[PDB]
């Protein structure tokens, strides 16, 4: 009863009309295939160029891209998860992920807690709030962004609040096979949840993104996967760690 | 500069002279191969029979097996990690793991925090202390027992205190491939540490143990592995998650 899509593509740095036109095209193709939600990659709208987003992308330009993405969700009739800089000035915003429903209503907004490397840490403010968890489509959805999912604590924070399906815009480059190969399957099994991971692919902003977008089910197995080329992955989704964990002790030992 | 051994074998329920004679034999063979430490499986001395340990194994019998195991470490000249019931009466003790050095000195004792299933929870008291971390052989070692390693929080507790090599007596049955296949490699990569896992194998106490004893290095790869038959595995051991994790937030979100 739930069919999701993941958009894997290459963005052009600082060209939102080009990158959002790719998202519009993917949303229309996902909807034609009966997908009910489209997940898109981290910072796709402006490309994964942290220092140049900080230097050249204004709050007004981010708000115009956000309005365009709400319009795509409404006009293509499909829920949409995107990732842009946050709405504040360039010196105060983070990296965010948002979910709009097929009506264009923004159901949830999350600010990336675990920034990756010095360029992100200079260009963005880290989030301070736990991942949101909300009902959509018959299950509890949640959002995280790229490096967050590599911390078991961030996925456990979502699953502790009831998450069953964690959606992760990503921008993973450098042939980092261990993230989708080793960490994502453990995040699924150690919580009993499904995770969807939508990456860039190909050369962008001086990096070569890995592609490898994937949906991993609760037994850690891929339900669908892409390679290194652009694509639109469409997947039909079908003792106990969460109860047994001694959280009152663990919280004191981190 | 560090060579370790793991003993994978079948125990006989409630027959410590038989099971400790197997450990003595493995310790002598490990030492002949220049191993400096031998890791043995969970509750091997009495077999993995929780309800019968609670019903029939006295504090005196546990203390005699402990004295025998300290003697093996000394007399075979090899550090030894074993796992017995704890030293208290049958209604107050837990499942423990201990490390003795090659002099027979007990360096560390740990009580299993995460008991597995209702039979363990009736037969044993859970530990309340974090895993120990200590220098041995040129690195920081730590101890956990079976189900503990399946909680990222338990391995992160050890790595937060400096652990580099986590030694895990186990008793994993039922063809639970996801533990060594999916979870152990993530525990290694998400902390940057090595883990050694020594299981029973074959039918014992009405269960069929999986074998699959393994040492996994920090990239999640097996450095050595056994299948389903008894054996003695001998292995020569050769952005940053531990610093970057926002532990002050994670501790509030578990």
DSSP letter for each residue of B20-67 = HHHHHHHHHHHHHTT-SEEE--TTGGG-S-HHHHHHH--HHHHHHHHH
Query: Which backbone phi and psi does B187 adopt, to 5 degrees?
Result: -60, -40
Q: For residue B85, what is the DSSP state? A: B
Structure token pair of residue A24: 């519009």
Residue given tokens 């993104």 in the structure block: A209
User: CB-based contact (8 Å) between A157 and chain B?
Assistant: yes
User: CB-based contact (8 Å) between B218 and chain A?
Assistant: no
List of residues 6+ apart from B124 with CB closer than 8 A? B50, B54, B85, B86, B93, B94, B95, B112, B115
Question: From residue B244, how far is each of A130, A151, B47 by CA, in Å?
Answer: 16, 9, 42
CA distance linking residue A119 with residue A124, whole number of Å: 9
Bridge partners, A215 (sequence order): A196, A224
Contacts of B178 in chain A (CB under 8 A): 189, 219-220
CB contact under 8 A, B152 and A190: yes
DSSP H/E element including A236: strand A231-237
Q: Three-class SS of residue B96?
A: strand
Q: For residue A9, what is the DSSP state? A: B
Q: Tell me which residue of A203, A194, A205 sits closest to A230, measured CA to CA.
A: A203
User: CB-based contact (8 Å) between B240 and chain A?
Assistant: no
CA distance linking residue B254 with residue A247, whole number of Å: 6
How far is C-alpha B178 from the geometric centre of its chain's CA atoms? Answer: 18
User: CB-based contact (8 Å) between A175 and chain B?
Assistant: no
User: CB-based contact (8 Å) between B174 and chain A?
Assistant: no
Bridge partners, A209 (sequence order): A173, A202
CA distance linking residue A153 with residue A12, whole number of Å: 33
CB contact under 8 A, A130 and B220: no
Q: Three-class SS of residue A106?
A: strand
Q: Three-class SS of residue A40?
A: coil
List of residues 6+ apart from A135 with CB closer than 8 A? A141
Q: Which of B152, B154, B182 sits opposite A220 (nearest CB)?
A: B182
Query: Which backbone phi and psi does A216 adopt, to 5 degrees?
Result: -115, 125
Q: Three-class SS of residue B232?
A: strand
List of residues 6+ apart from A243 with CB closer than 8 A? none
Bridge partners, B8 (sequence order): B231
CA distance linking residue A154 with residue B250, whole number of Å: 7
Interface test with B, best of A152, A156, A160 (most B CBs within 10 A): A152
Other residues' Cβ atoms within 10 Å of the Cβ of residue B134:
15
Residues A19-28: contacts with CB under 8 Å, at least 24 apart: A19/A44, A19/A45, A19/A46, A19/A47, A20/A45, A20/A65, A20/A68, A20/A69, A20/A72, A23/A69, A23/A72, A23/A80, A23/A82, A24/A72, A24/A76, A26/A232, A27/A72, A27/A73, A27/A76, A27/A78, A27/A80, A28/A76
Domains and CATH numbers, chain A: 1-254 (3.60.110.10)
Bridge partners, B167 (sequence order): B143, B196
Cβ proximity of A5 and A76 under 8 Å: no
Residue A144 φ/ψ region, left for φ over 0, alpha for ψ in the -120 to 50 degree band, beta for the rest = beta
Q: For residue B73, what is the DSSP state? A: H
Contacts of A245 in chain B (CB under 8 A): 114, 151, 153, 254
Question: From residue B67, how far is each of B73, B81, B168, B207 by CA, in Å?
Answer: 10, 13, 21, 28
Q: Apex CA B132: angle with CA B129 and CA B136, to 5°?
A: 170
CB contact under 8 A, A246 and B219: no
CA distance linking residue A80 with residue B20, whole number of Å: 61
Q: Which of A130, A182, A247 sits opposite B185 (nearest CB)?
A: A182
CB pairs under 8 A between A and B: 115
Q: Tell me which residue of B4, B6, B8 sits closest to B211, measured CA to CA.
A: B8
Strand ordering across the sheet containing A194-198: A133-136, A139-143, A165-169, A194-198, A214-216, A222-225
Residue A243 φ/ψ region, left for φ over 0, alpha for ψ in the -120 to 50 degree band, beta for the rest = alpha
Overall resolution, Å: 1.4
DSSP letter for each residue of B153-180 = HHHHHHHHTT-SEEEEE---BS--THII
CA-based nearest distance B194→chain A, Å:
15
Q: Apex CA A80: angle with CA A68 and CA A36, to 5°?
A: 135
CB contact under 8 A, B157 and A253: yes
Chain A, nearest residue to B241 by Cα: A151
Cβ proximity of B65 and B71 under 8 Å: no
Q: Tell me which residue of A135, A88, A98 sits closest to A23, measured CA to CA.
A: A98
């Amino acid at each position: 009863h739930m069919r999701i899509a993941l958009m894997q593509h290459t963005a052009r740095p600082l060209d939102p009309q080009h990158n959002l036109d790719l998202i519009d095209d993917a949303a229309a193709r996902a909807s034609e295939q009966g997908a009910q939600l489209l997940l898109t990659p981290q910072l796709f709208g402006f490309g994964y160029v942290p220092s140049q987003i900080c230097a050249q992308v204004s709050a007004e330009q981010v708000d115009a891209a956000r309005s365009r993405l709400r319009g795509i969700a409404r006009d293509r009739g499909i829920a949409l998860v995107w990732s842009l800089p946050g709405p504040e000035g360039p010196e105060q915003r983070g990296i965010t992920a948002e979910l709009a429903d097929e009506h264009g209503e923004v159901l949830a907004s999350y600010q990336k807690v675990q920034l990756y490397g010095p360029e992100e840490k200079a260009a963005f403010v880290p989030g301070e709030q736990p991942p949101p968890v909300l009902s959509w489509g018959g299950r509890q959805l949640s959002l995280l962004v790229c490096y967050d999912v590599e911390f078991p604590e961030m996925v456990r924070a979502a699953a502790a609040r009831g998450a069953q399906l964690v959606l992760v815009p990503t921008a993973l480059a450098g042939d980092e096979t261990s993230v989708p190969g080793i960490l994502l399957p453990a995040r699924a099994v150690e919580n009993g949840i499904t995770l969807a991971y939508a990456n860039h692919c190909g050369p962008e902003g001086g990096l070569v993104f890995d592609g490898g977008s994937v949906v991993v089910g609760p037994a850690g197995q891929p339900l669908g996967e892409l390679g290194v080329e652009p694509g639109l992955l469409v997947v039909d989704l079908p003792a106990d760690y969460l109860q047994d964990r001694r959280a009152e002790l663990h919280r004191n030992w981190l």
